[PDB]
Amino acid sequence: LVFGVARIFASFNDTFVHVTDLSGRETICRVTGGMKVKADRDESSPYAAMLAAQDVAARCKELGITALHIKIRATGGNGTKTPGPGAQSALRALARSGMKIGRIEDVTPTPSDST
């Protein structure tokens, strides 16, 4: 088994499923929700993240890593510091279509004092 780390940047507006190696620098594959759903209103849908996670898991098992460390984040500067329906449904679709999950971490940027 090979662990790859997936950053799920789940805003209220769009969702980003991003898969990198343990360094975090070498991008394996990324698929957003806007590139899978036509409506900008529906760009942040659990359906969007479901299709995105299906595409990403298909790609990374066609590569054959089958194991992911998951790091979820949200807009953290002046935003909400809470992830999205993209994050929840994407994680669900991922570990349904395979992808032995290792360590989960909610790494959001939390400012000490912003504005």
Binding site: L22, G24, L63
Partner: protein, 225 residues
């Protein structure tokens, strides 16, 4: 389904995984397991060798699946990499952070926390900063809900903390420092020496940042590995 691009933008896509290739990572000495994973990186050739790329990158792995102990599920570490062999990638310590979930788990109302930051220089000319965090003890058999310490006690406790950390981090080398950091001896000694001025509920070293590395001693590096 239907594309949306501008006129003449989508070039021909190329498979990158042809020129992408694997490299087994190897961990330094004091951790229990050496194999930590694999790294996909671009293939080497002229015009920016993958040797230079792999010298560039850094890694982040967790002490749980390093020590094979779920007690260190927090306290994630960061490893630089300076060496490369055939299909192998030796690593060296760079940093130690906690989990933000662990910090939020540790903060609590009606008890105070004291932080301390120190800039220590170990024997190997490594300049590093240690940020330690300590939460005040709630004494058994008490009725008063708030366990507040006066500001004089807080400053004296931070002074003792800086003294203890500096005295037990300026005597040893980096390998001895991380062999100290793994079983958390430093927080134990801080508690043992500060409980006389004010008892502390728990003392952790929440961050360890190596700022400057001045040497490239492959002898010492392979001595670790």
């Amino acid at each position: 389904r239907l594309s949306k691009g501008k006129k003449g933008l989508k070039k021909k896509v190329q498979d990158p995984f042809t020129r992408k290739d694997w490299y087994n990572i190897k961990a330094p000495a004091p951790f229990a397991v050496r194999d930590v994973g694999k790294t996909l990186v671009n293939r080497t050739t002229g015009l920016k060798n993958a040797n230079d790329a792999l010298k560039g990158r850094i890694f982040e792995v967790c002490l749980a699946d390093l020590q094979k102990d779920e007690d260190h599920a927090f306290r994630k570490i960061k490893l630089r990499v300076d060496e490369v062999q055939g299909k192998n990638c030796l690593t060296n310590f760079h940093g130690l952070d906690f989990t933000t979930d662990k910090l939020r788990s540790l903060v609590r109302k009606w008890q105070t926390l004291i932080e301390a930051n120190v800039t220590v220089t170990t024997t190997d000319h490594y300049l590093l900063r240690l940020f330690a965090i300590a939460f005040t003890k709630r004494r058994p058999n008490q009725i008063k809900k708030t366990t507040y310490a006066q500001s004089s006690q807080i400053r004296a406790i931070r002074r003792k903390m800086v003294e203890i950390i500096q005295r037990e981090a300026a005597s040893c080398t980096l390998h001895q420092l991380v062999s100290k950091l793994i079983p958390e001896v430093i927080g134990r000694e801080i508690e043992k020496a500060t409980q006389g001025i004010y008892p502390l509920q728990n003392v952790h070293i929440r961050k360890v940042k190596l700022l400057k590395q001045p040497k490239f001693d492959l002898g010492a590096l392979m001595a670790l590995h």
